Every structure is written in structure tokens, then in C-alpha cells.
Amino acid sequence: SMLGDVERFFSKKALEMRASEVRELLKLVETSDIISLAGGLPNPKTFPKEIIRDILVEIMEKYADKALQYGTTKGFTPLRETLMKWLGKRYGISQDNDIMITSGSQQALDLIGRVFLNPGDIVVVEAPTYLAALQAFNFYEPQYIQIPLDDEGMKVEILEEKLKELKSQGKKVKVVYTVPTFQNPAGVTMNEDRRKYLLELASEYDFIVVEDDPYGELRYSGNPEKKIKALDNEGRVIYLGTFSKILAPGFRIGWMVGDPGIIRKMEIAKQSTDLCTNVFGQVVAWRYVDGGYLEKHIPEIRKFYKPRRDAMLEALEEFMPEGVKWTKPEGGMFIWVTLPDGIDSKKMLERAIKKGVAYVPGEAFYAHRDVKNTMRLNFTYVDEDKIMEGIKRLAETIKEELKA
Amino acid sequence: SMLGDVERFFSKKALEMRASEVRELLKLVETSDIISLAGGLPNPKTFPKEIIRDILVEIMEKYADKALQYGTTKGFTPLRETLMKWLGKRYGISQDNDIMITSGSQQALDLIGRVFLNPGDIVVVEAPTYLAALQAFNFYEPQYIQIPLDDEGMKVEILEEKLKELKSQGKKVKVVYTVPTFQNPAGVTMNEDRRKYLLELASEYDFIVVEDDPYGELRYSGNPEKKIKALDNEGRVIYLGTFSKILAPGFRIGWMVGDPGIIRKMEIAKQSTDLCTNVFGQVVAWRYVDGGYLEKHIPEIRKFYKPRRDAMLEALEEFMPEGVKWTKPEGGMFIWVTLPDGIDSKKMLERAIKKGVAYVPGEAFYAHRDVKNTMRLNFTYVDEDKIMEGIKRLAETIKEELKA
Ligand SMILES: *Cc1c(COP(=O)(O)O)cnc(C)c1O
Ligand SMILES: *Cc1c(COP(=O)(O)O)cnc(C)c1O
Ligand SMILES: O=C(O)CCC(=O)C(=O)O
Ligand SMILES: O=C(O)CCC(=O)C(=O)O
């Protein structure tokens, strides 16, 4: 810096901000020939480019002034209306909720932090959870309580235990943040009974639930779950959806659905952070949903990713040594691996990279960074054939790591 | 709200957020046939829709995967490169600065607040200043020092006086925020001597200057000023530009240029608020600048707005009673009017609306809401002929207000 101790200008929060060492390494790995299973991106082969092209022409012919001008903070009305119609028909989400357009669900999470969190307020997350949600919330200084998952998602029973123990300390949780379907990073889905149990606790202990659902349409097997938001009679759930994996992430459009009191506050908070979400992408998304193209395209995304999931699950079963375990997602973009004998997968990544494969070490996904034997693998954006070869390389890395 | 008192969940900052009731009234005024001089929007007749259409075609042919995928937090590299080439050639901004793409300069202002401001840190603003900048910064709880403007922009003399008084109290300012060319709302421009004088203060008193410049290309008369950032030898200036009025606001793309140490921190802060600025709009903006289209389009914007500024200035001279004063902008979107005899323009707005004209009361533009006899008029987006009629109605409103 020219200033040169530029830190003398920084806020207390800025002084605690740091770039991820791991994320920097992984940026590098992506530009090389290593087989990376570390990505979190959807595959551009799933972007509906011809429908997008037709929609762009349509906008310049018919909607140019609306797409080009500033928008309201709350969002482009036709997109808000078409999304609530979609959500009600498809999922049985109630129309008495309100809806705000966001600049991605990342912006929803930042705004949830601004609107709800005072320093020291308690947020419950799953262990593991979505690392960007921890990043969003961390700016607001919450305390976290972590609730492990199993193959049926959040162990809501341990959440009841922890809520009782907090209550005995005179304390309460303010927000439970859940990614309950095809989790990033775990790949598992909260079952129906647990969704209902979470909501009874939400009532009994008076907290807000944030349900982040980027992947529910990327279902490859099994039957659709009920959204927590569709079971929400009290209006305690804030539901987040996004176009990132069902259209493309390049337009940075998502939506937040919830109690109108909560939405109204979110709108005022948003106004000062970005004025409005880009209206041009909102008009594109509106034509995409309202024109029926989202509905028609969803099966093409599923057809593309399913065999990639299945190839990875096949390779793990054939190559992984005993004592390695992994989740079996019915949808989404990730499979989550648990390593035996105390291997530290952060320490192992150096060995894996040397053997030609990368993954994201699981530690980063725990609020308390306190579990070390887990890894996130992605199947959406490796070259297919490279899924088999990448899983072999990782299996051999684990074999050698296991040798003292 | 379904939750009963939903306020029980809100953070301390959320509890202080309120919708502007002036802004609510003016929303309604816009949908009626009152002549509104209250807008802050550029005119869609200036949007380069043909060029945009060609650019969209080009992107789907050649750049679709980049435009549709997630981007890096820092921004789309070709856009960052083309902007720095543009800013160096056009303005002499130095290439040792770094650049980050933002989701509008509104997002730049929020991020400046996040990165620099602890509660109680002192921010200097002009009096008046841009209301949304006050909104962005208010979340971070600064103390403001207001420095009045004259027809040559900020009275930097008074800033030196206030910096010496604060120093005597053992205090310092952290940031001076300036809109030094065709100010929103005042329409005036800081002269060259004062730009140099501000930077001497910034060195002597050790503060950062944020230069927000959305309008410098919308110059209708006179000669181009030197950007503060072009005089900035010490790397103390963070320069904000935006495509809102030179392309169209619908893509919500801006940029922030400054010391690489400050930009690096800004990138980490932004990552948690929105992951990245919409890449699709950044590819559009890149073709727009790199293809020469921006440079070709700017004279078309100037040709459009100039006669509207001139009609409004003619109408004010012909119609306004003695003792009314207004600024004489060489550019931008606004004229700023000062009323005599202690008229309160917020109180007068009810009378103006009854007579068929609206404007924005000046009070909202003062950090300390302490001046009551000013108004912001916009000439960019009234249907022109209505500029003369609007100014006449406002002149008659002021004459009636001056009576008992
Ligand atoms: C993919 C992902 C998102 C997407 O966020 P956007 O900002 O909308 O792109 C949000 N939450 C989780 C858990 C994700 O995995
Ligand atoms: C027009 C305007 C802006 C524009 O902000 P964006 O978020 O880029 O649209 C910023 N600052 C001022 C002073 C303005 O008048
Ligand atoms: O690469 C990106 O910008 C997406 C990163 C991501 O999906 C996340 O960390 O939330
Ligand atoms: O109407 C808009 O969103 C633009 C408002 C604006 O420019 C502002 O308040 O800063």
C-alpha cells in the first residue's frame, strides 16, 4: 500500500477480515491440470442459453425501459408475482407471505445478519453448514451453536437438548439457519418429521428459521420433500431461493419469502446496501419463470447431473478403502466424505494435490472448525471421465495417508 | 405481521431503520399527472438501446459461459482492465491504483462504511450531500461534520477551520466524502484550487477522501475539471464511478479505484455481502467500454440533457420572484434552489403538490437536517415542455407562500 500502514484507517471488523488460505490455494488448483473435486459451481452445460438468447431479444423489443432503469428496492413486481405463483403451486407456500428480490441469496444472508443480529446473539447452524453463510453472519458477531447432521439431516433431537441447556443458562437462540435439502456441503436432506419437529421447537422457544434452498429442483432420485416454509403456519420461516443453479448464477438474482413485517424491514435495510437488485436480470428471470421455461428446463438439469452423481458414488464404492464413509445425496451438487482413524483432511490436501486431485477440507464448514476428518466433493463440474479418475486418485491418497 | 410484535427479533440498527415518508409521498406523486421535478432518474431516451442489443447478441455468441457463471469478488478482469485504461487516458488517473467492480456505487458506499467506520468515527460530508450516502454510512453510526457549499463547491476553507477545531478537542476525521462535480443535489462543482487544497488537508490531517463521480461525463458547458483522484499523489482518494447515467442503471455495475491495500480489504468485505457483482452486466459493460461505444455515446447524452437544463434555467430566471436563488450547473441532472424569508420547503411541498408540481425538500440532504429553505429540482426526466410549466407552478407556489 502507498499509505503504508493502511490498517490505521480500518474498522474493528475490517481488521478481523482475512482471505482464506485454502480458497487461495484452490483458485490456483482450478487453473492447472489437477482433477479438482473442490468446486462449488454449476456446469455451464446446464445454462439454458438458447432460451436466454430468445429472452434477451424479447426484452429489447418489449421491455427495454423497464429492464434498463433503476428498480424499486423490493424488486420487479412481475418477477415477485410470478415467483409467489410458482412457489404456491409447486410447493404449497402460503400466499400471505411477502417476497423481496435479492442480489443472490448471499445478499439475503447478509441482510438477515443486519436485521436480526446484535453482537452475541445466538445463531444455530448445522455442523457442517454453508461456509458463505458463516461469512455473511460473522460480520455481525453472533455466537454459534452447532447441531450435527446424520443421513437424515439436522439431528433436531440434539437441537432440543441444546435449547433446554441454553434455557437453563437464561439464554435463547435468535435464528436457526438450515440448508435442509441436498445440503452444501453434506449432501443430505432433513426428513419430514424433523422439519415438523424443528417448527414445534421454533414455536416453543420462539426463534426464526432461515431455510436456504438453492437445490430443491436438482433432484435426481426419490420424491420431493415438503419445504419447511410450506409447513410454516406461524410465519416463522424466511425462505431463500435463488436462480444460481436453476438458471445461471451470472444474473445474481434470488428471492426471500416471509412474514410481511420481516420483509418490510429487509427492504429498508437493502435500500442503503445496493439501492436495487439489477433490474435487467430480474426481467430476464421473470420471462424465464412466467414464460414456462424454468419448468421445462428443470428436467434437463436433472438429466445432466444425475449420471455425474452416480459415477462419483460408483467410483467411491469401488475404490475407497474400508472405514471411509460418504453421503448418498438424492440431489444437488455435493458428496460429503468422512475419513477413518483420525486423518486430518486439511493436512492431507497437500498429499492429494501431489497425487493430482483436490477437494475442499471439511474444517472450514464447521462454525467451531472442530471436526477435521471430512471433505466436500463436487460432481457437477468435473469433466465426467475425470470423476472416476479423481476418486481413484483420492482413494490412493487416503491409502497412503493411512500408512503411519 | 403474523408474529405479533416482530420487533422483538430485530437488531438495534434495524430498530432504528425507517421508510422516508417524503419518499413515500413522492412515489405516489410519480404515478399521477402532477409535474414532478423530484426525480433522481436518468431518462431512458439516453439509454443506448441499439448498442445494447448488439452487445447482447455478441455475448450469447462469444462470451456466454463467462457472462452466465459466477465471477470473482474483485470483478470481471477484462472490465477492470478496460476501465483502468479508460480512466488513465481520459482523466490521468494513475495506474498504480487497483480497481474493484461494485454493484453500483451504492454498494461502494456501504462497503466504505463497513471497512472504515467504527461507531463514532467522524465523516465529513458537504452540506448538502447525497442522501443515499448518508443512508449507507448511517448503518455504521458515524458522527458527521457538515461543510457548506457555494457556487464553487465545498468551502474547503471552512473544512480547515473545522479540522483545527476538532484537533483542539483531540479528535480527527477519518473520511471526507465529496461529490465534487455536478453535485447531487446542489449541481455545483468544486474548483481546481479547492481540489488541491482538500488533498493538502488530507495529507496534513491524515484522512481518506472518497470522490463519488457519477456525472462527470454529463457535461454540457465549460471545460472538464481535473478528477480529485487525478491529483492524488499519496493514494488517499478512493474514486467511485458508475454506469448508471452513462449506460443505464439496470445493470447495477460500478467501480471503485484506490490504493491496493484498501481495495484488497474491500474485496474481502464484499465477498460476504454478495459473492460477486452480476457478471452478465459486467460483460455487457466491458463490451460497451472496450468496443468504443461509451466514448461514442457520451456526446448523445450531452445533446439530450443540455436543452433540458437550459429550459429549466430560462424558466427560473423568467418566473421566480426576487430573492429566490438557484445554482447554475455545467452538467449533471439537478438544479438546487434557495428560498428567501425563511420559507420551509418541506412545509411548502403540500402547497406545491396542490398546485400541480413536486420537488425534493432540501432538508433530507443535510446530515444535521438543519437547513429548511432549499429544494432539489431535476430536469432529466420531466417530459420537457413540462419543465417550463413545472417551474411556473413552483414560482406561483413560492409567491403564495410568501403571502401571510
Ligand atoms: C449455491 C448456494 C447458494 C447460492 O447463493 P447465491 O448468492 O444465490 O448464488 C446459497 N446457499 C447455499 C447453501 C448454496 O450452496
Ligand atoms: C446517481 C448517483 C449515484 C449512483 O449510484 P449507483 O448505485 O451506482 O447507481 C451515486 N452517487 C451519487 C452522488 C449519485 O447522484
Ligand atoms: O465462486 C463463487 O463466487 C461462488 C462461491 C460460492 O458458491 C460460495 O462460497 O458461496
Ligand atoms: O430510484 C432509485 O432507486 C434511485 C434512487 C437514488 O438514486 C438514490 O436515492 O440514491
TrEMBL record, chains A, B:
Any one of the GO BP annotations: alpha-amino acid metabolic process
Taxonomic source organism: Pyrococcus horikoshii (strain ATCC 700860 / DSM 12428 / JCM 9974 / NBRC 100139 / OT-3)
Domain Aminotransferase class I/classII large: residue ranges: 62-394
The organism's taxonomic lineage, starting at the top: Archaea, Methanobacteriati, Methanobacteriota, Thermococci, Thermococcales
Subunit structure: Homodimer.
InterPro entries on file: Aminotransferase_I/II_large, Class-I_PLP-dep_aminotransf, PyrdxlP-dep_Trfase, PyrdxlP-dep_Trfase_major, PyrdxlP-dep_Trfase_small
Binding residues annotated for L-glutamate, in chain numbering: 369
UniProt superkingdom: Archaea
Residues that bind 2-oxoglutarate 2: 217, 227, 242
UniProt-annotated binding residues for 2-oxoglutarate 4: 216-217, 242
Cofactor(s) listed in the protein's UniProt record: pyridoxal 5'-phosphate
Protein name (Swiss-Prot/TrEMBL): Aminotransferase class I/classII large domain-containing protein
Family: Belongs to the class-I pyridoxal-phosphate-dependent aminotransferase family.
Keywords: Aminotransferase, Coiled coil, Pyridoxal phosphate, Transferase
N6-(pyridoxal phosphate)lysine (covalent), modified sites: 245
Gene3D superfamilies listed in its UniProt record: Aspartate Aminotransferase, domain 1 (3.90.1150.10), Type I PLP-dependent aspartate aminotransferase-like (Major domain) (3.40.640.10)
Coiled coil regions, renumbered to chain: 149-176
Alphabetical list of Pfam families matching this protein: Aminotran_1_2
Residues where 2-oxoglutarate 3 binds: 217, 242
GO molecular function: pyridoxal phosphate binding; transaminase activity
Annotated binding of pyridoxal 5'-phosphate, by residue: 70, 105-106, 130, 184, 215, 242, 244, 252
